[PDB]
């Protein structure tokens, strides 16, 4: 309803992408943010990896493989390329596979060129700065197309006065993607700052800020299991 | 004797608190620093988690469950609340369960209110700053009640000139809790700075600084086992 | 041929050093950078650990144990000692075991003394600064013996404008060791910045900069297996 909940395929980077999508089905999510150079896996032939050089046949097969699992290949990233050729090929590929967003970590001088590509392919762009910070992204984005947005990192939720969502300030509306790293059961943490379940408080804040972008989750798949993460996904999804 | 050695229950956050306390028994420790929102586990009913809203009956049961295992619920934290109501409820709960310390990560404007609660409940407070640093805590604490102290993080022990214990400076005496994160066998590390076993050198420094607070240990329970950690606990405990 | 590829024994710090060397054989590497206080393991007696106090007999046995596995004990580190006695003993030990390099994290005032030891034992020194940065190492090293070099950390390869190799600048030639932390399959990462396999691009850059030092790799042995790492080692080694 309000926002989308997807998985960062990096979560399962030790698996093939097809296996990752099978896990995504077991988690009960309908969206993915895929990182490049993951082995695709059957039905793709061995040693074929995710990259913008995939043949038209393999691009069509990749689209089909997402579709039959009920998962949209909504995003690719994080891309941090150094040449215009790479950016061009990356945006063309994203468009060809049918992504609606790309997450990117560019230099400031690359933004002009990247914006032209966003327009050319009707691709939304969520900029991730290098992990002074909040001021630069707002200053850089001011006056640029609405396609040019922000990939916001949700750090360690929640600590008093370090609320990543409350930093949205003047660009709350340009926030297109939220990265949840190391998602835990009910967003529990060694440090907490909420009277209610942290994941409930998190969802409430997203509602209050009318976030309608993509919540892209990552977790440590060696330290957590599908059942544990499904506890958190419950609140992240059933609100929407 | 000199100091206390306890566990951070975050170590086993993938388990229930009762299971965590069973592990704490196998480790041979008599103290715990508990984080909120962990499932309690039997004898508590399913879906009951650690938080300051526990009924008087459940508070009494929690006290009993610690006591029969020979473990004191000495600390709760790290709390980083944003409202006075939350702080009030947290300190009341700590007192009700019989904690002697709480670890906290507040803003500077909250210290006055937090100090009033420390006095009101005779609760000691170990302040953890956001992970300029050493100066602020000393300046903030100067002239405040002896209950207002510091939760010191022991980073990567030991590197020349970056000794966290030697930073104690003028507030060595206000150091109430030391957090050991990612405890390894004999405190071995990829970088070392001692001629003797690092854990032996660490213990010696604690003796030299007359540390008599709580050493609160955390480790990666997926990368280490009880036997390995018991090697380090040996020196941390048998000195005292 | 061009450079050496070795393992950081920290990778397997949960094992004995002998077991670590067995794993190093299974990986197919001929060099090691060993951290101190690891249990040695059979044929050494129980509770004997790696440190500069090993008897001449045990030093000779350690040399033999490396040799029969086809692995050179090329480096020890990272050492971050606080006294001259410790440094002296560490360099003497490195020489006695037949290391050609030591990785170290000293204060600036210790460099003079450390350089004297490097000369005295013909030991190369790779300085690792505390993890303003690039300027200090160049300024500190200027005019010092060619034995005094740099241990460079390869962070998260590869992001545009944050290329650790391109920072080599004026001291490319004093770079003696490159630390690869958390090595992944084909150096894949959640953020990428290359059109080709990241490990291929990495190797190409090392060739272009004529790096001929030691690539010292570490990985998470709980999250990766020998087969996965052998995929990356393939390109790191077969280029040379």
């Amino acid at each position: 309803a309000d926002w989308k909940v997807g998985i960062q395929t990096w979560t399962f980077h030790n698996l093939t992408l097809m296996e990752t999508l099978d896990k995504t089905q077991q988690l009960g999510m309908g969206y993915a943010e895929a990182f490049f150079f993951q082995e695709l896996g059957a039905p793709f032939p061995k040693e074929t990896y995710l990259n913008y050089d995939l043949s038209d046949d393999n691009c069509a097969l990749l689209r089909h493989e997402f579709k039959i699992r009920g998962i949209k290949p909504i995003a690719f990233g994080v891309a941090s390329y150094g040449t215009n050729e790479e950016w061009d090929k990356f945006f063309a590929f994203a468009h060809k596979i049918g992504a609606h967003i790309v997450t990117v970590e560019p230099e400031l001088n690359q933004l002009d060129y990247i914006e032209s590509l966003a327009k050319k392919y009707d691709m939304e762009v969520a900029i991730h700065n290098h992990p002074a910070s909040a001021e630069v992204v707002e200053k850089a984005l001011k006056g640029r197309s609405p396609l040019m947005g922000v990939c916001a990192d949700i750090g360690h939720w929640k600590r008093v006065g370090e609320d990543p969502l409350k930093n949205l300030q003047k660009l709350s509306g340009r926030i297109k993607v939220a990265h949840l790293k190391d998602l835990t059961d009910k967003m529990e943490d060694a440090t907490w700052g909420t009277g209610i379940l942290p994941v409930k408080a998190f969802v409430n804040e997203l509602k209050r800020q009318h976030f309608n972008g993509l919540i892209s989750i990552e977790y440590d798949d060696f330290k957590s299991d599908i059942q544990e993460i499904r506890n958190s996904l419950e609140f992240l999804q059933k609100c929407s």
Side-chain angles (χ1 to χ4, degrees), chain A residues 1-129 131-137 140-141 143-167 169-240:
Chain A
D2 209 38
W3 55 77
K4 306 169 200 289
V5 188
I7 195 173
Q8 298 182 41
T9 57
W10 183 252
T11 298
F12 298 107
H13 67 266
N14 59 308
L15 304 182
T16 66
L17 179 60
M18 300 299 102
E19 290 166 348
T20 297
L21 295 189
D22 298 337
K23 291 277 176 171
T24 306
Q25 288 178 281
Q26 295 162 42
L27 287 159
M29 283 184 282
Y31 300 95
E33 173 176 352
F35 77 95
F36 279 15
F37 304 109
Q38 193 176 29
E39 173 84 347
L40 294 184
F44 297 92
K46 198 164 171 183
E47 311 300 340
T48 305
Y49 51 77
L50 183 59
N51 192 18
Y52 55 46
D53 65 351
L54 289 176
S55 68
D56 291 328
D57 283 4
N58 281 336
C59 284
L61 187 51
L62 185 56
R63 288 197 303 277
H64 172 75
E65 287 302 307
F66 274 92
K67 190 207 176 77
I68 67 173
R69 293 178 169 80
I71 302 170
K72 302 278 196 178
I74 196 83
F76 292 102
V78 184
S80 189
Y81 293 112
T83 75
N84 292 353
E85 183 184 17
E86 291 162 345
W87 285 118
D88 188 61
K89 290 170 185 273
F90 173 72
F91 273 78
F93 176 73
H95 176 83
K96 192 151 60 260
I97 298 302
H100 290 303
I101 313 176
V102 296
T103 51
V104 305
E105 183 167 326
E107 290 170 329
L108 302 180
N109 67 68
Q110 288 172 324
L111 293 181
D112 276 23
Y113 188 70
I114 288 165
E115 189 176 11
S116 316
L117 290 166
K119 292 194 221 294
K120 177 176 153 98
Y121 296 106
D122 189 28
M123 188 62 60
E124 293 189 307
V125 183
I127 294 162
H128 192 306
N129 79 139
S133 187
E135 172 55 35
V136 167
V137 294
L141 288 174
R144 291 183 183 280
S145 160
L147 299 165
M148 300 291 279
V150 178
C151 180
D153 279 12
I154 307 311
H156 270 279
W157 178 271
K158 187 191 200 288
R159 310 190 193 182
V160 64
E162 300 179 356
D163 186 332
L165 299 176
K166 282 169 64 186
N167 300 349
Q169 187 78 338
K170 202 181 177 188
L171 46 71
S172 61
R174 276 200 194 267
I175 307 298
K176 295 189 188 300
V177 178
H179 277 188
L180 264 53
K181 189 171 162 60
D182 291 313
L183 181 58
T184 62
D185 196 349
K186 288 138 188 147
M187 290 175 70
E188 67 185 10
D189 190 59
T191 303
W192 67 96
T194 60
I196 63 180
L197 274 182
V199 68
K200 278 194 160 104
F202 178 67
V203 161
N204 291 352
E205 282 209 17
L206 292 180
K207 265 202 79 195
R208 290 203 296 272
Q209 289 175 216
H210 193 259
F211 177 74
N212 56 13
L214 173 67
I215 305 175
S216 198
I217 74 131
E218 189 275 344
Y219 69 93
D220 192 333
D221 71 323
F222 289 91
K223 293 212 228 287
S224 273
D225 56 48
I226 283 164
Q227 288 312 125
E228 281 171 357
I229 301 299
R230 275 175 65 75
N231 291 327
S232 288
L233 293 178
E234 182 181 343
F235 299 100
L236 294 167
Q237 285 174 321
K238 289 159 88 158
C239 179
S240 300

